[PDB]
């Protein structure tokens, strides 16, 4: 169960 954290930056390791 996580709270809200929208993805706005690319993932690490691109």
């Amino acid at each position: 169960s996580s709270s809200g954290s929208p993805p706005r930056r690319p993932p690490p390791g691109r």
Epitope: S1, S2, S5, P6, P7, R8, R9, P11
Partner: antibody, heavy 115, light 113 residues
Framework: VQLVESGGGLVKPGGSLRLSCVSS????????MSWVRQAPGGGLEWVAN????????YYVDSVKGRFTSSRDNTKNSLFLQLNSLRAEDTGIYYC?????????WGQGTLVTVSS | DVVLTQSPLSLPVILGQPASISCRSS???????????LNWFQQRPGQSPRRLIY???KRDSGVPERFSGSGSGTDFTLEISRVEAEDVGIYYC?????????FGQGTKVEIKR
């Protein structure tokens, strides 16, 4: 809440173009902003993200190195610099609020890459 | 990149009939925070897109109640309980769970009069 773009126009291939977006109706300093473009006869392609203070800027791979972002929170303004323009950069450039929600869009501005 | 396949792409509907637009994702689309960042946008003729749905099923404040969303995982649906003449336009699905955010081709809704 309103978003107004400007700066689109005709530019020869290889040339440069500066797009601006002025916002109204919300605390600009609190939201990430984003640019989305629409190709002729085509759909939508995400272009760029920018942080609240402009410290973080990310771009779609097809424009990495050619486009640069800037932001001016004292004037509720967002900017996009298009360099070394290719034909496939032609389209409507939309200023959108709060990726990945894109809850508000501008009316768009047209970029025509042509000699 | 995640590919969003919309079906059908052309949707001619008799006025008042229900309609359903499907959006099929190439990947799971459930983000690490448990949320599914799937949106639906409506581009009416001559206008910019405007968001209809965010997070699969949450409807925007300025959108009529006859628009709804559903789905999970890789299959999602935009439902129109009653298609009005003003609903003509192109409907896009969009994902934000994978980098970068990508859109579907768009479904052109047409009234069959």
């Amino acid at each position: 809440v309103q978003l107004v773009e400007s700066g689109g126009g005709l530019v020869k291939p290889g040339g440069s173009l500066r797009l601006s977006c002025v916002s109204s109706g919300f605390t600009f300093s609190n939201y990430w902003m984003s640019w989305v473009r629409q190709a002729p006869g085509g759909g939508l392609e995400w272009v760029a993200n920018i942080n609240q203070d402009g410290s973080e800027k990310y771009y779609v791979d097809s424009v990495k190195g050619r486009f640069t972002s800037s932001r001016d929170n004292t004037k509720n303004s967002l900017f996009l610099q298009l360099n070394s323009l290719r034909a496939e950069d032609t389209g409507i450039y939309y200023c959108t609020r709060d990726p990945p929600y894109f809850d508000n869009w501008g009316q768009g501005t047209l970029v025509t890459v042509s000699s | 990149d995640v590919v969003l396949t919309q079906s059908p792409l052309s949707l001619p509907v008799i006025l008042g009939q229900p309609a359903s637009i499907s959006c099929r994702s190439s990947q799971s689309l459930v983000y690490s925070d448990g949320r599914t960042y799937l949106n639906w946008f409506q581009q009416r003729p001559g206008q910019s897109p405007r968001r209809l749905i965010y997070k699969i099923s949450k409807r925007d404040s300025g959108v009529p109640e006859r628009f709804s969303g559903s789905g999970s995982g890789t299959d999602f649906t935009l439902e129109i309980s009653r298609v009005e003449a003003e609903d003509v336009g192109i409907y896009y699905c969009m994902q934000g769970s994978h980098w970068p955010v990508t859109f579907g081709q768009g479904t052109k809704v047409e009234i069959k009069r």
